[PDB]
Amino acid sequence: IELWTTRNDTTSVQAFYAAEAGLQKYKAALFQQYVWREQCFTSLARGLDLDRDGTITPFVNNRLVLAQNEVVTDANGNPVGRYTATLYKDAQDDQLFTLVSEGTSGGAKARVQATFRISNSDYLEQAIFAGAGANKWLNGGATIRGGVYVVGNPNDPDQYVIEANGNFALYNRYDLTTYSEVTNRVEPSYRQVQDLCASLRVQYGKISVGGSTQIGEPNNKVKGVFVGRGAQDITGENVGVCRNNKGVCTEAMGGFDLSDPPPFPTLDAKLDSDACSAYPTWRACLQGKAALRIQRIGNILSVASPPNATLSPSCLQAMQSGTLTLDTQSVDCTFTRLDGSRGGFRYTYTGGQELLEVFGDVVLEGIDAVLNRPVDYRAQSGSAKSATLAVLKLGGNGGNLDINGNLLPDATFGLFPNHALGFVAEGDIYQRGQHVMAPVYAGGTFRVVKGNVLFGSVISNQFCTTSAGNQMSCNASQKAEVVYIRIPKENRPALLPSLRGGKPVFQVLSYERRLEHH
């Protein structure tokens, strides 16, 4: 709202009010279009979603009319004037917008206008976010339903960071009927999605694409391929080809398309997220927000949380060795709070279909974890049905995770992705179970066996596929698969990274009002 003192005649002041009525109405609407995108995502420079249903009305010749001859009314609801609000985008900078409201009132005409700089967070949505690798970021076959973001090595922007010549497919849809009886773990609205919002981004480096590689499909194809310094760093036999089961099928194709892009999140760097931004490091955050937190320096197991609640010796017995393996004997790491709330994790064994409930977030430092049998999970943190398990390194020991059986959420409790269990591993992750449904972070590398599929997302410094569980050699030629399933920001494991494309800004660069007639 803008208030000022004047000595102008009543006539011109009413012309100003008419215009200022238009500007401040649609400055609010413009800001509201800015908050609706901080909640598929498309930038403001490509139009507005005036409905708020995904229908975008674009800018024509950099201009978009928001209101033509709309009338301003007095307190009694009679016409005092008309105004016309027009929204203009800058030809050069796709973040600069000018809102203009020409007003008229009783034969007096006034014009007021404001320039904004608007940029959205653009929460990154990819099946695989890769880090810095070893000079290899994805090794071995893969079929990725979702985006793949790779950061690369800033001190070598000439390194092919993806030399896919076959053995690699990246799609922008999935349907969960194609997998063995896992559809009853996911919410109806989430079982077949045809817009995954996939893209290929590589911040530092080049990429090569050879025959039978498939970045998108002729029908449903990827929403952009933004690599390195420009379109120059998109090499290969298959660029511009978009025939079926070959080539790069893309809408847009240039260089890395992000300002303020996020670095690979690491335990020892600040992680600016709704839960962890106050702490100096992501690790300090996990440590401090953990419900259950156990450390292990050599043979000592020191409990650091819950500091005012008791544990069962069964719980601490299980991690004696420095490796928590679940398998065939139940382990109860829960405790009860002051107010009758539970905390920790509990792992029952059935004979059939196991259970691992997690109440709040739990982090084990200097401890490895292996879940050696299929297990259903249930997780909550008071209101929300989400939680995190962290295995962190401590003195170079621990921090690895092994999921050798299936790992799904329990249908009874909740359904994906309104029910998710997240995994932070500072070391490596090896999945030999056929189906695990979780968002996953591996500070080191994330290994997976041909044939097994992970639903959720992997953030990891390296991704690798292997021929068999026996193996740890990355050279593989068959395919593992990752299926990106968006998890809504609410009911998302708080202690996981929330990677943003850019910084959120809604800032006024200038404001002006001119009288144009009497």
Author numbering: 1 to 39, 49 to 142, 144 to 528
The article reads:
Natural competence is the term used to describe the uptake of “naked” extracellular DNA by bacteria; it plays a significant role in horizontal genetic exchange. Four ORFs (pilA1 to pilA4 [pilA1-4]) were type IVa pilin-like genes, and a fifth, comZ, encoded an unusual and much larger protein that lacked some of the sequence features characteristic of pilin genes. Mutation of pilA1-3 and comZ leads to a loss of natural competence, although piliation is maintained.
ComZ was crystallized and the structure was determined to 2.72-Å resolution. The structure had three ComZ molecules in the asymmetric unit, but analysis by the protein interface analysis server PISA did not indicate any significant crystal contacts. ComZ was not identified as a type IV pilin by PilFind, presumably because it does not contain key characteristic sequence motifs; however, the N-terminal domain adopts a type IV pilin-like fold, suggesting that it forms a structural component of a pilus fiber. The second domain forms a complex β-solenoid structure, which is inserted between the penultimate and last β-strands in the pilin fold through two short linkers. Protection against reductive dimethylation was used in combination with mass spectrometry and site-directed mutagenesis to identify two lysine residues in ComZ which are involved in DNA binding. They are located between the two domains in ComZ, on the opposite side from the predicted PilA2 binding site.
